[PDB]
């Protein structure tokens, strides 16, 4: 069992939970690939059995009559139909466990507080849209954000998948141009082109909210516009740099990832969007300052009258700090939930301690947990971590086009 | 052959050099341990033969002549004596190779410029001190720092080892009180008490340069006072914050690590101190702002009149950036070589590109290459990296007690 040291304090623990690692990652004794972004009834039964054991452990019914009854029933259903169905309480437990198990999520202190919307009866792309609208309305909650997931019907033999083609429920268009440059968010060029190809009339601003492309089983994707009053946005201003507001920058309240696959007990839910609230560095550092995103850093540094001709003036660091200040100030001014990277990493340290007592460890991806600015100023920098894959899980999946 | 992507540009390479990894790292298919600081004879001829082959490859002299001849003499030398002696040019080539192979070093663009002092004919703690003194004066060079390594004799069976007991050649003392808590550097509390427990009369200050504990084979260590004239230091001032100088902070010019073991062709040099020049974050972010180092961040924020009552003011980030500015400004004013983290990481990306075409890849430890502040503002953040062990190498070794 791997020994894990915290170098700030001197703490030492042993991750016994990693021995239960359900699947295999990309590393070998020869070479570590930890930094890479992208790392049959008998085996369905084996996964289902393990999940049922997890569930009956959680409700203190391990080895009970009800437990073996459920195991037998799942066995029988897989034999009769090639698959099985989760009970409502099992689905809620499995979705929370998937969040709990997500190695790259720093917000997991919240994992037990998750609103689970059961849309497994969804029949069409039109009903899917209605479920998604109510997810956005519930989770946004006029700025007092609430964590939620909506889970659409599972993958099943004989029918195609439900899929949301968008990577998030709220995204800004990226318009390719000539001179070659992108207007708007360069991360979203491909989905923007698909929306146009599917009949969307594009705008030409830098912050145009994309329509949704929703795919029902064995059907082409269908375009749905989000009511503007459902999409809460925050104009960005800085508390002391008054010219900052003239940049015309905005970001949206609700981070709602919609392109990942939820796996519970061998069953797969290719459409299950989930949302929480933002950590400010995701917006201020990555979305606004990445060179391949909005890339505002030099324009902000010039406006700040910093010396951008030499790197040792640390103009990049100074400008990025004030952009993050602007994000926090603006969301707080707008009364939209947001967490700075210091509070978030401190709460993640408490989660690690909670999980060491509860389960004997915690899967965590150091390079994703450590924030993209001020890394060693946060306590997670000094915490050794062990990365591994537990199920139930959120998994990446290929784009449906 | 692992596929490696840069996410800022979109470019892809394959690391074919990984296929040559020798020592097994700590990771397995089921769990990654990349964030851990410490990863948990006819064998001599195999490592010597391999290293000799490396040497003659690098000079286009594989496949006959002195290559064939050098192979037999190491064979005979080991057959006769059980060990072997490196030629001077091999010691030079091997030292540069171990530096080139160091996965955690961001300064490897410089790997070809290394001054190798051959101290293999040393045989007393008195000779060591003269060697270490030659190195420090040469490497310091009045502030125009020059990369250098001094190689004391290779370990051999039956006799003790040459070892430097200090982790670096220049370190600051750390002293306790009625309350354990430290005046000085907490990293060096252990060696401070060893030095005092060997004759050294302690100082009173927060920046007392420690003496050297030098260990000739099979003898107790011997204290040596470094000539103050030979330890170049930089008082810390800020370009616009007039009071920063009054904080009384200083740091030294030369980073010279002295507790690592140099391994070349199966031979082991437990005493082989190497030096370069600092990257400014090492001083300003880690040494001065780590909570378990000088922990000055709140003191600087009070002086800047920052609101330390809420994390979301980003007072930690602001104070940290100004400390790093003060380090860079002070070292440049003192005309002591230093490199900021933007310049250093940009050079490492050029190094990665050079190594791709020369050797087919480059062992790199993402968590150590990405700097401890402003990570995603540097290009290395967006570069996937592959970590593995090649020989020659610098290795960690246990403390000599
Ligand atoms: C409640 C507030 C939350 C915060 C502050 C938060 C924070 C974060 C952050 C900063 C990341 C890294 C993303 C990036 O760098 O681009 C992340 C990743 C992730 N989050 Fe959370 N999150 C929250 C809620 C949730 C919820 C409710 C779920 C699911 C139910 C979730 C699941 C995930 C997953 C699956 C990933 C990355 C996938 C992986 O591990 O490979 N998060 N989160
Ligand atoms: C010339 C300028 C150099 C710079 C700017 C530089 C910078 C750095 C930095 C920032 C680290 C990270 C360590 C930490 O953050 O605590 C490092 C590690 C390291 N450096 Fe360099 N360094 C330089 C020269 C050298 C030289 C000359 C050698 C040896 C001949 C060397 C060998 C190493 C080793 C062995 C490590 C630890 C790496 C590992 O364990 O894989 N460096 N360096
Ligand atoms: C619920 C939630 C809240 C939050 N506050 N943040 C979140 C960030 C991500 C996330 C996941 C993966 C990912 O990247 C995947 C790689 C592009 C394929 C990114 C973008 N870095 C963000 C996912 C969910 C989040
Ligand atoms: C030549 C050189 C230049 C430089 N500019 N920097 C350097 C930093 C280290 C180094 C290596 C390992 C290490 O960590 C060991 C762990 C504490 C036991 C630390 C301290 N973090 C520094 C080693 C050499 C360096
Ligand atoms: C190549 C590198 O793994 C990549 O840029 C990662 C690093 N760490 C990250 N960490 C978070 N939270 N989000 C990210 O997108 C990334 N990107
Ligand atoms: C736990 C973690 O591995 C540890 O804090 C590492 C992270 N990255 C680092 N990177 C550098 N350059 N130096 C360090 O000491 C560390 N410390
Ligand atoms: Cl985002
Ligand atoms: Cl140091
Ligand atoms: Gd102002
Ligand atoms: Gd402008
Ligand atoms: Gd004052
Ligand atoms: Zn690994």
Let me know if residue B386 belongs to a domain: no
What are A110's two structure tokens?
A: 């919240």
The angle that helices A41-58 and A88-100 make with each other, rounded to 10 degrees, is 90
| Region class of B153: left (phi > 0), else alpha (psi between -120 and 50), else beta | beta
Let me know if residue A9 belongs to a domain: no
Looking at the fold, whether A23 and A84 belong to one and the same domain comes out as yes
Q: Of A34, A92, A102, A185, which is best to mutate to test ligand 1, by the most ligand atoms within 8 angstroms of its C-beta? A: A102
Q: Rounded to a whole number, what is the distance in angstroms from the first to the last CA of chain B?
A: 42
Looking at the fold, whether A191 and A207 belong to one and the same domain comes out as yes
Experimental technique for the deposited model: X-ray
Looking at the fold, whether A228 and A329 belong to one and the same domain comes out as no
Which residue in the set B18, B25, B366 is minimally distant from A35, CB to CB? B366
Contacts of B23 (CB under 8 A, 6+ apart): B389, B391, B393
Let me know if residue A5 belongs to a domain: no
| Residues paired with B279 in a beta bridge | B339
For residue A387 and ligand 1, the question of a CB distance below 6 A is answered with no
CA distance A164 to A161: 10
Which of B186, B377, B380, B386 is the mutation pick for testing A, counting most A CBs within 10 A? B377
Ligand-binding annotation for A343, yes or no, is no
- CATH number, domain of A183, equals 3.90.440.10
Looking at the fold, whether A59 and A86 belong to one and the same domain comes out as yes
Tell me which residue has tokens 């990481």. B345
Looking at the fold, whether B153 and B179 belong to one and the same domain comes out as no
Which domain does A218 fall in, by range? 121-146+161-232+396-400
| Residues paired with A376 in a beta bridge | none
The protein residue with its alpha carbon nearest to ligand 3, atom 11, reads A257
Using the 3D structure, point to which of A306, A325, A343 is the last residue of a domain. Answer: A343
Let me know if residue B390 belongs to a domain: no
Q: Number of folded domains in chain B?
A: 3
Residue B42 CB coordination number (10 Å): 6
- CATH number, domain of A266, equals 3.90.340.10
CA distance A35 to A368: 9
Looking at the fold, whether B181 and B131 belong to one and the same domain comes out as yes
Sheet holding B267-269, edge to edge: B267-269, B261-264, B393-395
Q: Of B27, B33, B35, B37, which is best to mutate to test ligand 6, by the most ligand atoms within 8 angstroms of its C-beta? A: B37
Looking at the fold, whether A224 and A212 belong to one and the same domain comes out as yes
CB contact under 8 A, B21 and A9: no
DSSP state, A284?
I
CB environment B328-364: b (16+ within 10 A), e (fewer): bbbbeebebbbbbbbbbbbbbbebbeebbeebbbbbb
Looking at the fold, whether B101 and B87 belong to one and the same domain comes out as yes
Chain A: closest CA distance from residue B126 (Å): 36
The reply to whether B104 touches chain A by the CB within 8 Å rule is no
Identify each DSSP E strand in B108-203 by its residue range: 115-118, 148-151, 163-164, 174-175, 183-184
Let me know if residue A85 belongs to a domain: yes
Looking at the fold, whether B152 and B40 belong to one and the same domain comes out as yes
Let me know if residue B388 belongs to a domain: no
Let me know if residue B3 belongs to a domain: no
- CATH number, domain of B290, equals 3.90.1230.10
HEC letters along A202-260: CCCCCCCECCEEEECCCCCCEEECCCHHHCCEEECCCCCCHHHHHHCCEEECCCEECCC
3-state secondary structure of A148: strand
Nearest Cα to Cα of residue A274 among A108, A28, A55: A108
Using the 3D structure, point to which of B343, B359, B382 is the last residue of a domain. Answer: B343
Tell me which residue has tokens 């997500």. A102
Let me know if residue A384 belongs to a domain: no
All residues of chain B having their beta carbon less than 8 Å from the beta carbon of residue A7 are 37, 292
Residue A310 CB coordination number (10 Å): 12
Contacts of B260 (CB under 8 A, 6+ apart): B272, B274, B394, B395, B396, B397
Which of A21, A310, A312, A318 is the mutation pick for testing B, counting most B CBs within 10 A? A312
Stated resolution in angstroms: 1.8
Looking at the fold, whether A223 and A324 belong to one and the same domain comes out as no
Looking at the fold, whether B136 and B106 belong to one and the same domain comes out as no
Cα–Cα distances in Å, from A378 out to A227, A348, A370, B346, B380?
Answer: 39, 10, 8, 25, 20
All residues of chain A having their beta carbon less than 8 Å from the beta carbon of residue B285 are 376-377
Greatest CA separation for chain B? 72
CB contact under 8 A, B29 and A33: no
CA distance B49 to A126: 70
Looking at the fold, whether B60 and B140 belong to one and the same domain comes out as no
């Amino acid at each position: 069992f791997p020994r894990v040291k915290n170098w700030e304090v001197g703490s030492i623990t042993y991750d016994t939970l990693s021995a239960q690692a359900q699947q295999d990652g990309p590393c070998t004794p020869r070479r570590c690939l930890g930094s890479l972004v992208f790392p049959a009834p008998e085996q369905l039964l084996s996964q289902a059995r393990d999940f049922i054991n997890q569930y009956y452990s959680s409700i203190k019914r391990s080895g009970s009559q009800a437990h073996e009854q459920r195991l037998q029933e799942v066995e029988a259903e897989v034999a009769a139909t090639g698959t099985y169905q989760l009970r409502e309480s099992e689905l809620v437990f499995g979705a929370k466990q998937a969040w709990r198990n997500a190695p790259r999520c720093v917000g997991r202190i919240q994992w037990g507080k998750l609103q689970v919307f059961d849309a497994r009866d969804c029949r069409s792309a039109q009903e899917m849209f209605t479920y998604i609208c109510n997810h956005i309305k519930y989770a946004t909650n006029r700025g007092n954000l609430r964590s939620a997931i909506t889970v659409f019907p599972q993958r099943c033999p004989g029918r195609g998948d439900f899929r949301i083609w968008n990577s998030q429920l709220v995204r800004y268009a990226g318009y390719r141009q000539q001179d070659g440059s992108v207007r708007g968010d360069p991360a979203n060029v491909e989905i923007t082109e698909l929306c146009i190809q599917h009949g969307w009339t594009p705008g030409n601003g830098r912050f145009d909210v994309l329509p949704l492309l929703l795919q029902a089983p064995d059907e082409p994707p269908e375009l749905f516009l989000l009511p503007p009053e459902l999409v809460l946005e925050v104009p960005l201003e800085h508390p002391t740099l008054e010219w900052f507001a003239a940049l015309g920058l905005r970001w949206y309240a609700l981070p709602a990832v919609s392109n990942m696959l939820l796996e519970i007990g061998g069953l797969e839910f290719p459409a299950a969007p989930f949302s929480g609230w933002y950590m400010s560095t995701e917006i201020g550092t990555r979305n606004l300052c990445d060179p391949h995103r909005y890339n505002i850093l030099e324009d902000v540094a010039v406006c700040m009258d910093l010396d951008t001709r030499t790197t040792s003036s640390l103009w990049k660091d100074k400008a990025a700090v004030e952009i993050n200040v602007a994000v926090l100030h603006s969301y707080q001014l707008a009364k939209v939930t947001i967490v700075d990277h210091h509070a978030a990493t401190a709460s993640f340290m408490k989660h690690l301690e909670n999980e060491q007592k509860a389960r004997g460890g915690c899967p965590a991806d150091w390079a994703w947990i450590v924030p993209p600015i001020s890394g060693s100023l946060t306590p997670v920098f000094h915490q050794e971590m062990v990365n591994y894959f537990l199920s139930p899980a959120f998994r990446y999946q290929p784009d449906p086009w």
